[PDB]
């Protein structure tokens, strides 16, 4: 049984601009574990990682039927499983969370399906 | 059980150009209730509302296996609930309609999953 | 129950460059039947078709967890669907595109 669906599309430029401005951005969006990978990356990949997590969390919030400003970015965490795919390691949902993220050199998209 | 899935992306610019070559464009795309919302917004947000409604209605039509021009714009209605999330208040479907909409400065995407 | 979910966004440029780089790109990405369609098309519509197929197959591959073993055709209503794929459950596919990129979404259900 499906109990929610959310999607999100984001321009990487907006994320790169945010990072270039205040250093506190990535920190607000990512947990400690996520920051570990974020800081281990270089150039485009580094921005893409952050953008993807932002998009995934935004998509999840919509899947729950609300805004990320109510859940909070630190309330969610996206790591990579043994098969290398991104997944919610932390989220206020008990069922299965189907997540998928994809990007180009200009956009990142994410889709979330909550299942019970 | 899932009975349909559809996604759609619309360029805001195309929507506005349409609002230009056809003065009554909005009126034909939106229901009376959607029009009342549309007429209360302005600038970018107004266009985004209209474009997002088009995306949602097309995503749904594709989820039903067809197109919006065939299904009819007036037979679909997307309003916003108490939490501000878009949802189908009107549709020729007896099951659950899981809708999500997201946009950038230039595009708006919608994803619909139908469930019985 | 859902057993997989995958999406993809692909810029038309990556596909356009790929076609030129190796003329056999399309042939490698598309099955015989898909190629027949590709070849019958021209210009932007032709590129879009190739990009949409690449996108859909990528989305499917990500949903599962050779693009020649995957085939996406169009039904009588014009909607794209997987006619061939290493999965016996239901494959819910949807593709959409702008002038610069294509997106695809796949949900696998049993």
Swiss-Prot record, chains A, B:
Cell location: Cytoplasm
Binding residues for Mg(2+): 8, 58
Keywords: Cytoplasm, Fatty acid biosynthesis, Fatty acid metabolism, Lipid biosynthesis, Lipid metabolism, Magnesium, Metal-binding, Transferase
GO molecular function: holo-[acyl-carrier-protein] synthase activity; magnesium ion binding
Presence of the UniProt keyword Zinc in the record: no
Keyword Magnesium: yes
Gene3D superfamilies for this protein: 4'-phosphopantetheinyl transferase domain
Chemical reaction(s) catalysed: apo-[ACP] + CoA = holo-[ACP] + adenosine 3',5'-bisphosphate + H(+)
Pfam family, one: ACPS
Enzyme Commission code: 2.7.8.7
GO biological process: fatty acid biosynthetic process; lysine biosynthetic process via aminoadipic acid
Xref: PANTHER family: L-AMINOADIPATE-SEMIALDEHYDE DEHYDROGENASE-PHOSPHOPANTETHEINYL TRANSFERASE, PHOSPHOPANTETHEINE TRANSFERASE
Assembly information from the UniProt record: Homotrimer.
Function: Transfers the 4'-phosphopantetheine moiety from coenzyme A to a Ser of acyl-carrier-protein.
NCBIfam families: acpS, pantethn_trn
Annotated family: Belongs to the P-Pant transferase superfamily. AcpS family.
Protein name: Holo-[acyl-carrier-protein] synthase
């Amino acid at each position: 049984m499906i109990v929610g669906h959310g999607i999100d599309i984001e321009e990487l430029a907006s994320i790169e601009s945010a990072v270039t401005r205040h250093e506190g951005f990535a920190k607000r969006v990512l947990t400690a574990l996520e920051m570990e990978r974020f800081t281990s990356l270089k150039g485009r990949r580094q921005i893409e990682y952050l953008a993807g997590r932002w998009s995934a969390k935004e998509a999840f919030s919509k899947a729950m039927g609300t805004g990320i400003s109510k859940l909070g970015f630190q309330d969610l965490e996206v790591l990579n499983n043994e098969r290398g795919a991104p997944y919610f390691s932390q989220a206020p949902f008990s069922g299965k969370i189907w997540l998928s993220i994809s990007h180009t050199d200009q956009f990142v998209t994410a889709s979330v399906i909550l299942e019970e």
